[PDB]
């Protein structure tokens, strides 16, 4: 006959939506230890033999995990920082001498008038008949808070490790699009290095495909899903801020000072970006090979834009400073890019919650790689704004499963009767 | 630092084995269910959320040890019974599955019948054998 | 307004004694391992989560509920150059767990998968007769 033998420790699993925990390698960065646990000793891997498993990067929750975490881990270092209400006054702002930088004047924000400031053009808004006068762009909307100056901004090579009873899986097939099953599967204790890099229209400091380029989308027979393309051979970018800046902290309200911009040592020159015009041309022609598969043959050339300056420009960070680059001229050997530096931003496009940038004195220049692009057809035109699909650029393999340990199977062994 | 290949079949390693073959890695799966390797290297320097995930993992563990305690099978890993099989669950015979099929597929044959198995193991193996004690 | 001397034993009282004198003392270190502004609660889970692990490893080895037990795993003389009666009559435990610290991982794998895994497939198939 067949008696049912209990088996504890059998390795099967469901799929579970659960909570992971961040592990960052290792001063006073917000990602250093006030969000995560310290340095990663070693990532592991066990590769599994005879196993098939489906995957999806659009029904995934790890990609929803950062968007529910970086919205708040960024927010943690914004509660104690200095709110700036009393600056919202009449802003008599006239042009700087050697007019996208305006010398402003306003009555005093004292602890006890006719004070002074000068700052960027894209944070003022015009008002009624007394011309050459302005106001901030968010007063009658919501609050505005400057960053604390002792706060870092560098994306850190994080490692999502996995908690108890939860194994992170990883497919390894080179021929893996955004969906479908996989065969060469493997289990890790912990993910590889991921850096939290914020970008529109592109993909900065990401990760490289295996000497190839493969676009990914789910409903690409719609205009619904964003066609996201990874790039082999990162294109190096150079972006500068040549204006040798000065700062000061003039007094704000009862017992506080407000970090603004002093005088611009060195005359007014536009901060721009560079890209080698040879490499960009060949790189697009790599993609249209793969576009031919989902279609001299360069039927696609066209660019579009329109709407949000977060989306119209090219938004990213550099040295703790936000950029907004014009990208129409680049799409269609160095290439100068007109790139704007706004100072009052919106953090993850949420209505109301605004953040003010620290005006850094001196000069700023940074360089970076590029591993991917953002496109929308109907021919392909660059999208931007959806922050979550930046995160899907990395986690297009992984998965979180819950271990069921326990199982049964019949056999020809019966429990002997106790005497 | 170097490292030679495994000769002891690490975590989830025999997931492709047959049911008569993956039984040799039952010990590795059970040990690392609880807390994994210990993370959080005493760095308490600066919440609430953290510890709910820590408390659930114990409750997942204590669910099963009590359930093996009712099933007369605490401490063991493999134990027999007095319950015969009912082939309406799955009539698939012995070597059709045993030396032919992994564990992920055997669970996808018995998942509809799961709670039905648990009452029968409870009653006719220990609620039964409580009436043999005397 | 109280006080009398020691009667049975103390907590960690045998931790300078020999193995042959500490082996009759294990219960006092066995009882008080578990019983004893959020930061009390974060202690009250780590004290649990350490107890289950040591309980779990005894469970896998066919040695749950006993304080001591034996296996059939052979001691390997490569692990210890110490003589037998030096161990049971001269060495304390605190010294002893600095000497076999490196080999400990080899030991625990060579209990489960060596024997108590193997003592179930052998055990289940002693039926049919």
């Amino acid at each position: 006959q067949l008696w049912v033998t209990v088996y504890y420790g059998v390795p099967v699993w469901k799929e579970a939506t659960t909570t992971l925990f961040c592990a960052s390698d290792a001063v006073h960065n917000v990602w250093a230890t006030h969000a995560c646990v310290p340095t990663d000793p070693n990532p592991q891997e066990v590769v599994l033999e005879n196993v098939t498993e489906n995957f999806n990067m659009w029904k995934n929750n790890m990609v929803e995990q950062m968007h529910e975490d970086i919205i708040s881990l960024w927010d943690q270092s914004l509660k104690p920082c200095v709110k700036l209400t009393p600056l919202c006054v009449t802003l008599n702002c006239t042009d700087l001498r050697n007019g996208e930088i305006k010398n402003c004047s306003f009555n005093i924000t004292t602890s006890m008038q006719k004070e002074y400031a000068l700052f960027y053009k894209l944070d003022v808004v015009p008002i009624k008949n007394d011309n050459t006068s302005y106001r901030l762009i968010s007063c009658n909307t919501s609050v505005i808070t400057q960053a604390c100056p002792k706060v870092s901004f560098e994306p850190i090579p994080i490692h999502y490790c996995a908690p108890a009873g939860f194994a992170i899986l990883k497919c390894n097939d080179k021929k893996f699009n955004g969906t479908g099953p996989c065969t060469n599967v493997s289990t890790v204790q912990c993910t590889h290095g991921i850096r939290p890099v914020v970008s529109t229209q592109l993909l900065l400091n990401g990760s490289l495909a295996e000497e190839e380029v493969v676009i990914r989308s789910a409903n690409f027979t719609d205009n619904a899903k964003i066609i996201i393309v990874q790039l082999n051979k990162s294109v190096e970018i150079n972006c500068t801020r040549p204006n040798n800046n000065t700062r000061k902290s003039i007094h704000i309200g009862p017992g506080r000072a407000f970090y603004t911009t002093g005088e611009i040592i060195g005359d007014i020159r536009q901060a721009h970006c560079n890209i080698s015009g040879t490499k960009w041309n060949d790189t697009l022609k790599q993609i249209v090979v793969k576009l031919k598969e989902q279609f001299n043959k360069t039927i696609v050339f066209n660019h579009s834009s329109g709407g949000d300056p977060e989306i119209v420009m090219h938004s990213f960070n550099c040295g703790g400073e936000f950029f907004y680059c014009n990208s129409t001229q680049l799409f269609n050997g160095t290439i100068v890019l007109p790139c704007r530096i706004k100072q009052i931003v919106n953090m993850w496009q949420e209505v109301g919650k605004a953040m003010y940038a620290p005006p850094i004195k001196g000069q700023i220049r940074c360089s970076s790689n590029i591993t991917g692009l953002i496109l929308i057809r109907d021919i392909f035109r660059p999208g931007g704004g959806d922050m979550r699909d930046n995160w899907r650029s990395e986690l297009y393999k992984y998965k979180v499963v819950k271990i069921e340990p326990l199982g049964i199977a019949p056999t020809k062994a019966k429990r002997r009767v106790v005497q | 630092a170097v490292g030679i290949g495994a000769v002891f079949l690490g975590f989830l390693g025999a997931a492709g084995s047959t049911m008569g073959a993956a039984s040799m890695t039952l010990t590795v799966q059970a040990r690392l269910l609880l807390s994994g390797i210990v993370q959080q290297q005493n760095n308490l320097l600066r919440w609430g959320i953290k510890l709910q995930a820590r408390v659930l993992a114990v409750e997942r563990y204590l669910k099963d040890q009590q359930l093996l305690g009712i099933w007369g099978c605490s401490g063991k890993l493999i134990c027999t019974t007095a319950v015969p099989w009912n082939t309406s669950w799955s009539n698939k015979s012995y070597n059709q599955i045993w030396n032919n099929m992994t564990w992920m597929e055997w669970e996808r044959e018995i998942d509809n019948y799961t709670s039905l198995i648990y009452t029968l193991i409870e009653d006719s193996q220990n609620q039964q054998e409580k009436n043999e004690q005397e | 307004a109280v006080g009398i001397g020691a009667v049975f034993l103390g907590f960690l009282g045998a931790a300078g004694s020999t193995m042959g004198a500490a082996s009759m003392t294990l219960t006092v270190q066995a009882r008080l391992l578990l019983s004893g502004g959020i930061k009390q609660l974060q202690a009250r889970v780590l004290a649990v989560e350490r107890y289950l692990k040591d309980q779990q490893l005894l469970g896998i080895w066919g040695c749950s509920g006993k304080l001591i037990c034996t296996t059939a795993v052979p001691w390997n003389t490569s692990w210890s150059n110490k003589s037998y009666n030096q161990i049971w009559n001269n060495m304390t435990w605190m010294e002893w767990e600095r000497e076999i610290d490196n080999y400990t991982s080899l030991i625990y794998t060579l209990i489960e998968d060596s024997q108590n895994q193997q003592e179930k497939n052998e055990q289940e198939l002693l039926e049919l007769d």
Epitope: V46 | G3, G5, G10, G36, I37 | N102, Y103, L106, T109
Partner: antibody
Framework: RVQLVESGGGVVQPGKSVRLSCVVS????????MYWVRQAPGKGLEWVAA????????VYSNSVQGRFLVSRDNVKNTLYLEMNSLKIEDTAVYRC????????????????????????????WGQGTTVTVSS | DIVMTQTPLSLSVTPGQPASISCKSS???????????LYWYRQKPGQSPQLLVF???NRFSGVSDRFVGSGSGTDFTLRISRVEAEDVGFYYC?????????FGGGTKVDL
């Protein structure tokens, strides 16, 4: 003092195979990894090979795989390197090297089920020995 | 795999000099145990190599008190104050993060 002495030197023709020797002094040697380094006649230095104190694991460089063979004998306190299928451009001076620390036994990772030997830098060489491949 | 460089190698000296030579590598070679793999050796010409520094700012015992190296991450420097007449030879930088092991040219030192 740990006085590593090196011997077995020989100058031959290409296509042949020779073997060196490295003997130690005042030294337990059962728990110590060894190395082999290469001073080409005008060059700086480059690592060749490595062995455990167990003589269980042997890592090489990319080049001499399928040419060399390292083997300890802690009874003899003597290291062998039978260098099969010599090249002419591998004419150099070869040495042995005690590791800086004492290595230990492997510690088995409980999760991976996968051993890990530990190898660090070296501190004490021998006097040098000569192998030359010419015609 | 992982490689590294040195300074201009030939550096004539002065008795009582702050001599310093960097060795920038293509990796942050900090191991899992927090021990930074770095090994400064030296050979006089006609001699075997000889250990100077076994880890970042850790002189090897039995060697005199004038050899204070440093470094972190990619770049690693070896500062020597009180330059003497027994300093002639080459300086060998060494990785120990992962096999294979590398070295450098060996910075020439004369008067």
């Amino acid at each position: 003092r740990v006085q590593l002495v090196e011997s077995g030197g020989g100058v031959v023709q290409p296509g042949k195979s020779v073997r060196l020797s490295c003997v130690v002094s005042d030294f337990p040697f059962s728990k110590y990894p060894m190395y082999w380094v290469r001073q080409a006649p005008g060059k700086g230095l480059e690592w060749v090979a490595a062995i455990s104190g167990d003589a269980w694991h042997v890592v090489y460089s990319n080049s001499v795989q399928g040419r060399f063979l390292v083997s300890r004998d802690n009874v003899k306190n003597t290291l062998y390197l039978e260098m099969n299928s010599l090249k002419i451009e591998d004419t150099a001076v070869y040495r042995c090297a005690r590791m800086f620390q004492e290595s230990g036994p492997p510690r088995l990772d409980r999760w991976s089920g996968r051993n890990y030997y530990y190898y660090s830098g070296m501190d004490v060489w021998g006097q040098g020995t000569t192998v030359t491949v010419s015609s | 795999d992982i490689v590294m460089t040195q300074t201009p190698l030939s550096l004539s000296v002065t008795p009582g000099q702050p001599a310093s030579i960097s060795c920038k590598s293509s990796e942050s070679l900090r191991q899992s145990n927090g021990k930074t793999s770095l090994y400064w050796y030296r050979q006089k010409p006609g001699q075997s190599p000889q250990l100077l520094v076994f880890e970042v700012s850790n002189r090897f015992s039995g060697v005199s008190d004038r050899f204070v190296g440093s470094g972190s991450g990619t770049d690693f420097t070896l500062r020597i104050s009180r330059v003497e007449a027994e300093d002639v030879g080459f300086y060998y930088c060494m990785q120990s993060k992962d096999f294979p092991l590398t070295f450098g040219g060996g910075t020439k030192v004369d008067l």
